[PDB]
């Protein structure tokens, strides 16, 4: 059925593209109402989403401030282990690398 | 190379490219190199609780005695919360020459009353071998026969000292039917046990089970009816063997075994369960039975 | 069984 | 009853489209690797076809809803205006929660970029330190020659084990007897024995 | 994008096409999501939150991947009914202006992106509206703009300043 | 053989048809499909084999969800025995493949590749879930309704044909 269904999909999608190109926006019937019942329903639906999208952009701002404090703490700890790691690399460079086997046995 | 290769392996496995595998019939395995006949014969007719064990980090088959001491001092420590632990490499329970050598862990109690005899093996497991680094000795399989209390404590010790983890291996009815089909497809002689398939209908109030315990020769002549391509077993052939079971059970009892699930497949080669208490290893085909079991433990690992 | 045992 | 009627009209404007697409498909009477490529071509040219369709439907609907709502200013008290005042209050609470989000997120992005720079830099530095430890490992191999390091190492192990015995028979002999342990300058430096 | 900015810092084209494809796929997710949900404004807010981080790719992450809206998202945000998503779209357009101007400096992102962006620009700047109608009812073109700007219209002010 | 457009639609009726051998899980899934008060009159139809005995006045089936119990090979072999009674115009948008029992992964007599191969060789969405638990039904049943409003044409932007182009 894979090929016989790909062919059917192509045949039906060509018809759908021919039908959507046929579809002129049919606003000429519109609605004999004064459309206040639709405009003020969409406005009411906004009030039922803007009340809820403010409730999620306040949560985003809260988790943004908390994550900002957490990332500042993590960046401080990263800078600390940055300077510490760099100074450790600089110190251990030509501090323990200048170890001879003969000098090592002399320390023993 | 060392990690991204496992990433690609996981990606390919989850991609689910066609996986009816033309698995070869289990081949009569001559006992390779040095397999201790007493030890190997001791591991055969003993019911192993299957586990999938992640690779043992910083593991070495040289430091056996000190690991044995650390685990023995921990086993008796959990009794504080009479016992000897002998780590024993097996030397021959591996599929390829590059596989990690299988080693045993036996809780020996005065005499050699082996209480637990846990067992780790990696046979034909070169799909996880080429994905771990050199520090990991990957043993996907873990085979514990003793009580679950000792198993779930030596598992904790292994987690603590090797960062290896034990997911309890569960052979689904798909793999159970597969191994049922190939173990009647072997060239074995003097069938030890009847080829029994323990089904379990999915009733909500009741828990009825069915034991389709074929005569092992009748299940071979029935397999030869559904066997057409030689050497390899197909998912079509496996499903045809299972469907010949289904249509010969529904022919009599008018209940659809295909509407049920396998829970155990007893065979003259090897008995196998679903819940984990799986591997009875009657015949010495075990380098292939364990090959399937490791390649199934690798799947749970990766 | 076909009610054979 | 009119909103439900509009739901009916929107449902049957689309079920009719399904019927007509099937009718045209049945009116109409190979390269499977490309049979999905000329199929994905449809849902990219269908997508343009009924995307501009929706952007024209929305345009011609919002134009009417603007003209239709343009008659509410000339209308009387229209408590929906009191509702829209609450909508205005709601808007500022969001776009002033977006003004902060245009600065908090910018600072977070800067901090994350700094942290990733100092993470890759730290991995480079720690890998250099670890390969320097590996360079110390061949210095350890300079000890594994074992011509005279091994003998003195074994002497250290076999003589500290005598120095960790006599030491621990001073923690047990400056203890049990009539010791007067720390009230004596001599034993004071010999008590408090260094490990 | 964080791990791709460092791939510029640590010395492309095949990874470039991956973030571009992710944006195009999400823009395919988010243009049919408003079809299933009938251009739900709560969903459009998160959609433009995604593209809030797509406009600011060149300026922020140094990647030359200024990728525009699908038409079904930009036009349904321009023809939306609440000012809180309209000015978000306007801010995203202003950030697209800034990033395209920046990409013209250091240098497909040059021909087709600029064509579609001018398409979006002429559509919006000519249209720049019921949400603004409601704001005006709440209330000399400069006075109206100042009233809008003081009422949190930050993205609109930023894009008008262009 | 069932056809997608032999019957005219209702008015707000979106009538799914669940096809699965086990009917306890089908009944539970249908109960969860109507637990939420949606905006469409959902007339859920249950079945065991798509042959579906020929009873007139049956509504225009806007969706068939082949609930394939991965625990039982019967629920698969009957599904392929019910897929040979479907239109090639039915598999475009109005066919889903529920795979219940999956995720438990220890009772699966069917490998989850076999069901994905089945649902990919018929070019139809394959929606995984676990019908024995309510917590995974009520979140998956609301997925079969939002699919159902797509195929029935209740969302006035997305056809059944448009659906599999989104779920491919």
Query: For B148, how many CA atoms within 13 A lie in the half-sphere containing its CB?
Result: 6
Strand ranges for D41-143 from DSSP E? none
Angstrom distances, CA of residue B290 to CA of B32, B33, B237, B283: 15, 17, 22, 12
Task: Residue count of chain C, please give it.
Answer: 5
The residues that bridge with B141 in the sheet, in sequence order, are B52, B121
CA distances, B51 to each of B67, B269, B278, B284 (Å): 20, 20, 10, 21
D55 closest CB neighbour out of E3, E5, E72: E72
Chain D CB within 8 Å of residue E152 CB? yes
Q: Is the dihedral of CA E48, E53, E59, E64 positive or negative?
A: negative
Q: Which residues pair with B103 in a beta bridge?
A: B89, B120
Residues in A whose CB is inside 8 Å of some CB of E read 39, 42-43, 45-46, 49-50, 52-54, 56-57
Candidate from D14, D19, D21 with C-beta closest to F156: D14
Among B282, B262, B122, smallest CA distance to B186 is for B282
Q: What is the 3-state secondary structure (H, E, C) of B52-76?
A: EECCEECCCCCCHHHHHHHHHHHHH
Separation between Cα atoms, residue B159 and residue B74, nearest integer Å: 13
d(CA B227, CA B241): 8
Which residue from A39, A43, A50 is facing E84, i.e. has the nearest CB? Answer: A50
Distance of alpha carbon D102 from alpha carbon A61, whole angstroms:
10
- Least Cα separation, residue F156 to chain D (angstroms): 6
> Residues for chain B: how many in total?
302
d(CA D142, CA D140): 5
Please tell me if residue A9 touches chain F, with a CB cutoff of 8 Å. yes
Spatial distance between the Cα atoms of B209 and B199, rounded to a whole number of angstroms? 6
Please list the residues that pair with F65 across neighbouring strands: F18, F96
Q: In the Cβ-directed half-sphere of B146, how many Cα atoms lie within 13 Å?
A: 20
Chain F's closest residue to B168, CA to CA, is F106
**DSSP code per residue over chain E:** -HHHHHHHHT---TTHHHHHHHHHHHHHHHHHHHHHTTS-HHHHHHHHHHHTTTGGGHHHH--S------HHHHHHHHT-S-HHHHHHHHHHHHHHHHHHHHHHHH--TTTHHHHHHHHHHHHHHHH--HHHHHHHHH--HHHHHHHHHHTT-HHHHHHHT-
Question: Exposure string (b/e) for D81-108, b if CB count within 10 Å is 16 or more?
Answer: beebeebbebbbbbbbbbeebbebbeeb
Q: How far is A57 from D168, CA to CA, in rounded Å?
A: 69
D83 neighbourhood in chain E, CB within 8 Å? none
Q: How many residues does chain E have?
A: 162
**CA triple E68-E73-E78, angle to 5 deg:** 100
3-state SS, chain F, equals CCCCCCCCCCCCECCEEEECCCHHHHHHHHHHHHHCCCCCECCCEEECCCCCCCCCCCCCCCEEEECCCCCCHHHHHHHHCCHHHCCCCCCCCCEEEEECCCCCCCCCCCCHHHHHHHHHHCCCCEEECCCCCHHHCHHHHHHHHHHHHHHCCCCCCCCHHHHHHHCC
User: Quick one: E52 exposed, middle or buried, by C-beta within 10 A (0-12, 13-18, 19+)?
Assistant: buried
How far is B178 from F98, CA to CA, in rounded Å?
24
For residue E46, give both structure tokens. Answer: 């998160």
Mutate to test the interface with B, among F106, F118, F120, F130 (most CBs of B within 10 A): F106
Cβ distance F126 to F115 under 8 Å?
yes
Give DSSP secondary structure letters for D123-188: HHHHHHHHHHHHHHHHHHHTTTT-SSHHHHHHHHHHHHHHHTTTTTTTTTTTTSSS---SSSHHHH
State the CB neighbour count (10 A cutoff) for residue E121.
16
Strand (E) or helix (H) holding B209: strand B209-214
Helix (H) or strand (E) segment spanning residue D6: helix D2-27
Q: Resolution for this model in angstroms, one decimal place?
A: 3.3
Contact by Cβ (8 Å): E121, D61: no
What angle do helix axes A2-22 and D2-27 make, rounded to 10 degrees? 120
At E14, phi and psi to the nearest 5?
Answer: -90, -20
Instruction: Give the helix/strand (H/E) hosting B89.
Output: strand B84-89
Beta carbons of D65 and A38 less than 8 Å apart: yes
Do the bridges between strand B141-144 and strand B209-214 make them parallel or antiparallel, or are there none, so unpaired? unpaired
Q: Give the whole-angstrom CA distance, residue E151 versus residue D92.
A: 6
Helix (H, G, I), strand (E, B) or coil at B248: helix
DSSP B135: T
For A29, phi then psi, to 5°, come to -80, -35
Taking alpha carbons only, the member of F121, F87, F120 closest to residue F5 is: F87
User: Which of D91, D94, D102, D104 to mutate: most E Cβ within 10 Å?
Assistant: D91
F91, F159, F162 member nearest A5 (Cβ): F91
d(CA E97, CA E86): 17
Pairwise CA distance, residues F151 & D169, whole Å: 90
Question: How does strand F95-99 pair with strand F63-66?
Answer: parallel
The H or E element spanning position D78 is none
**How far is B149 from B189, CA to CA, in rounded Å?**
38
* Contact call for A16 and F161, based on CB within 8 A: yes
| E35 interface with F at CB cutoff 8 Å | yes
Put simply, the answer to whether E38 touches F158 (Cβ < 8 Å) is no
CA B99 – CA B129 distance, rounded (Å): 7
Task: Inform me whether the C-beta atom of residue B275 falls under 8 Å from chain F C-beta atoms.
Answer: yes
At residue B197, φ and ψ (nearest 5 deg) are -115, 110
Domains and CATH numbers, chain F: 13-167 (3.40.50.300)
Chain A residue numbers with beta carbons less than 8 Å from the beta carbon of E82 are 46, 49-50
> How many C-beta atoms lie closer than 10 Å to residue F12's C-beta?
16
What technique solved it? cryo-EM
- Most E CBs within 10 Å: which of A36, A38, A46, as the mutation test of the E interface? A46
Q: Report the distance separating Cα D115 and Cα D109, nearest Å.
A: 10
- For D96, half-sphere exposure in the C-beta direction (CA atoms, 13 angstrom radius) is 11
Instruction: Output the six-digit token pair for D151.
Output: 């003998």
Pairwise CA distance, residues D70 & D56, whole Å: 20
**How far apart are alpha carbons E89 and E98 in whole angstroms?**
14
Length of chain A: 108
Decide if E42 and A52 are in contact by the 8 Å CB cutoff: yes
Q: Of F119, F48, C4, nearest to B259 (Cα)?
A: F48
Which residues make Cβ contacts (< 8 Å) with residue A18, sequence separation at least 6? D24
How close, in Å, is residue E7 to chain D by CA atoms?
11
The answer to whether the beta carbons of residues B33 and B282 sit under 8 Å apart is no
Contact with chain F for residue D18, Cβ under 8 A: yes
**Residue B261 to residue F116, Cβ atoms within 8 A:** no
Q: How far is C4 from chain B (nearest CA, A)?
A: 10
D94/A50 Cα distance (integer angstroms)? 8
Q: What is the spatial distance between Cα D31 and Cα A11, in angstroms, rounded to a whole number?
A: 15
Smallest CA–CA separation between B253 and chain C, in Å? 8
Give F-chain residues touching D17 at CB under 8 angstroms.
Answer: 153, 159
CB of F135 less than 8 A from some CB of D: no
Give the Cβ contact number of residue B96 at 10 Å: 11
Residues B60, F42: Cα–Cα separation, whole Å: 64
Per-position DSSP letters for A54-107, written without gaps between them: HHHHHHHHHHHHHHHHHHHHHHHHHHHHHHHHHHHHHHHTTTTSS--HHHHHHH
Chain F residues touching residue A16 (CB < 8 angstroms): 159, 161-162
Question: Of F72, F55, F65, F87, nearest to F143 (Cα)?
Answer: F65
Q: Å from A53 to nearest chain E CA?
A: 6
What does the alpha-carbon distance between residue F73 and residue B242 come to, in Å, rounded to a whole number? 10
* Degrees, nearest 5: CA angle E37-E42-E47: 85
Q: How far apart are CA E24 and CA B247, in angstroms?
A: 52
CA dihedral for B233, B234, B237, B239, sign (positive or negative): positive
Report the candidate in F144, F91, F164 with the shortest Cα–Cα distance to residue E32: F164
Alpha carbon separation from B17 to D44, E75, F61 (Å, rounded): 27, 41, 33
Helix (H, G, I), strand (E, B) or coil at B239: helix
* CA F142/CA F36 separation, integer angstroms: 8
Candidates E46, E159, E13; CA nearest to E95 is E159
Chain position carrying tokens 């398939």: B197
CB B118 within 8 A of CB B157: no
- Read off the tokens for D172: 């047990």
Q: Does residue D43 sit at the F interface (CB-CB below 8 Å)?
A: yes
Q: Say if the Cβ atoms of D102 and E72 lie within 8 Å.
A: no
Q: Quick one: tokens of F102? A: 């999956």
Contact D36 A20 (CB under 8 A): no
The answer for B 158-217 residues in CB contact with F (under 8 A) is 170-174, 177, 202, 204
Cβ–Cβ under 8 Å, residues B99 and B267:
no
**Chain D closest CA to F95's CA: distance in Å?**
15
Q: Is F79 on the interface with B (CB under 8 A)?
A: no
Query: Closest chain B residue to F22 measured between Cα atoms?
Result: B259
Neighbours of F152 (CB within 10 A): 29
């Amino acid at each position: 059925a894979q090929l016989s269904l790909l062919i059917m999909q192509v045949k039906c999608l060509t018809a759908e593209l021919s039908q959507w190109q046929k579809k002129t926006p049919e606003t000429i019937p519109l609605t004999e109402d004064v459309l206040i019942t639709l405009g003020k329903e969409e406005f009411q639906k906004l009030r039922q989403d803007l009340e809820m999208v403010l409730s999620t952009k306040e949560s985003k701002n809260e988790k943004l401030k908390e994550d900002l404090e957490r990332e500042q703490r993590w960046l401080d700890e990263q800078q600390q282990i940055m300077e510490s790691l760099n100074v450790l690399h600089s110190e251990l460079k030509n501090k323990v690398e200048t170890f001879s086997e003969s000098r090592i046995f002399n320390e023993l | 190379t060392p990690l991204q290769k496992r990433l690609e392996s996981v990606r390919k496995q989850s991609s689910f490219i066609l996986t009816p595998p033309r698995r070869k019939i289990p081949q009569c395995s001559q006992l390779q190199e040095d397999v201790d006949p007493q030890k190997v014969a001791f591991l055969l007719h003993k019911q192993w609780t299957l586990y999938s064990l992640t690779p043992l980090y910083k593991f070495s088959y040289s430091n056996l005695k000190e690991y044995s001491r650390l685990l023995n001092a921990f086993i008796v420590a959990e009794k504080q919360k009479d016992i000897k632990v002998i780590f024993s490499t097996l030397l021959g329970m591996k599929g390829t020459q590059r596989d990690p050598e299988a080693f045993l862990v036996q809780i020996v109690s005065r005499e050699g009353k082996v209480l637990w005899t846990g067992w780790f093996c990696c046979v034909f497991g070169d799909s996880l071998l080429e994905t771990v680094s050199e520090d990991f000795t990957c043993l996907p399989l873990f085979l514990a026969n003793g009580a679950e209390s000792n198993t779930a404590i030596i598992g904790t010790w292994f987690q603590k000292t090797f960062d290896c983890y034990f997911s309890p291996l569960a052979i689904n009815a798909f793999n159970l039917s597969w191994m049922a089909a190939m173990w009647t497809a072997c060239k074995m002689d003097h069938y030890v046990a009847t080829t029994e398939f323990l089904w379990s209908v999915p009733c909500s109030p009741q828990s009825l089970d069915i034991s389709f315990a074929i005569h092992p020769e009748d299940a071979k002549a029935l397999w030869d009816s559904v066997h057409k391509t030689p050497g390899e077993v197909t998912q079509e052939e496996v499903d045809l063997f299972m469907d010949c079971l289904y249509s010969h059970f529904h022919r009599h009892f008018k209940i659809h075994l295909s509407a049920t699930r396998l829970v155990r497949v007893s065979t003259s080669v090897a008995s196998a369960h679903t819940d984990g208490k799986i591997k009875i290893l009657c015949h010495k085909y075990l380098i292939g039975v364990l090959a399937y079991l490791t390649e199934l433990a690798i799947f749970q690992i990766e | 069984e076909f009610i054979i045992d | 009853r009119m909103t439900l009627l509009l739901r009916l009209r929107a449902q049957t404007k689309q079920q009719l489209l399904e019927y007509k697409s099937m009718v045209d498909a049945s009116e109409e009477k190979k390269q499977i690797e490309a049979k999905i490529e000329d199929l994905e071509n449809e849902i990219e040219e269908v997508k343009v076809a009924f995307e501009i369709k929706k952007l024209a439907l929305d345009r011609m609907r919002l134009s009417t809803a603007l003209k239709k709502n343009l008659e509410k200013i000339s209308r009387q008290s229209s408590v929906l205006m009191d509702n829209m005042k609450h909508l205005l209050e709601l808007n500022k609470l969001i776009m002033k929660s977006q003004q902060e989000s245009w600065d908090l997120e910018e600072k977070l992005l800067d901090i994350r970029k700094k942290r990733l720079q100092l993470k890759q830099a730290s991995e480079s530095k720690l890998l250099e330190i670890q390969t320097e430890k590996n360079k110390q490992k061949i210095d350890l191999d300079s000890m594994e020659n074992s011509e005279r390091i091994k003998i003195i190492r074994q002497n250290l192990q076999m003589e500290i084990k005598i120095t960790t015995v006599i030491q621990h028979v001073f923690q047990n002999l400056i203890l049990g007897s009539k010791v007067n342990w720390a009230e004596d300058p001599a034993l004071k430096e010999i008590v408090l024995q260094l490990e | 994008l964080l791990w791709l900015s460092m791939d510029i810092h640590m010395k492309l084209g095949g990874s470039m096409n991956s973030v571009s494809k992710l944006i195009h796929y999400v823009g395919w997710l988010s243009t049919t999501a408003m079809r299933l949900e009938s251009n739900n404004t709560f969903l459009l807010h998160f959609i433009l939150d995604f593209y809030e981080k797509v406009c600011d790719i060149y300026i922020n992450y140094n990647l030359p991947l200024v990728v525009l809206f699908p038409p079904g998202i930009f036009y349904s945000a321009l023809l939306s009914l609440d000012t809180s998503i309209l000015n978000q779209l306007c801010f995203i357009m202003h950030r697209y202006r800034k990033n395209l101007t920046a990409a013209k400096k250091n240098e497909n992102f040059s021909s087709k992106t600029y064509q579609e962006f001018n398409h979006y620009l002429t559509s919006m700047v000519g249209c720049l509206h019921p949400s603004f109608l409601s704001y005006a009812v709440s209330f000399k073109w400069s006075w109206y703009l100042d009233y809008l700007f003081s009422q949190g219209l930050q993205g609109l002010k930023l894009f008008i300043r262009s | 053989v069932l056809r997608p457009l032999d019957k005219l639609p209702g008015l707000n009726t979106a009538t799914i048809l669940l096809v699965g051998t086990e009917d306890a899980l089908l009944q539970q899934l249908a109960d969860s499909m109507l637990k939420e008060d949606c905006a469409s009159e959902l007339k859920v139809h249950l079945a065991k084999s798509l042959p579906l005995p020929s009873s007139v006045n049956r509504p225009r089936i806007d969706l068939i969800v082949f609930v394939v119990n991965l625990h039982s090979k019967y629920s698969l072999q009957n599904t392929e025995e019910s897929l040979r009674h479907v239109d090639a115009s039915f598999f475009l948008g109005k066919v889903c493949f529920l795979a219940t029992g999956a995720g438990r992964e220890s009772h699966c007599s069917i490998h989850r590749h076999t069901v994905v191969k089945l649902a990919h060789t018929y070019q139809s969405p394959l929606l995984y879930c676990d019908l024995e638990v309510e917590g995974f039904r009520a979140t998956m049943a609301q997925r079969l309704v939002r699919v159902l409003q797509i195929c029935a044409g209740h969302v006035p932007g997305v056809s059944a044909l448009n659906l599999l182009s989104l779920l491919r």
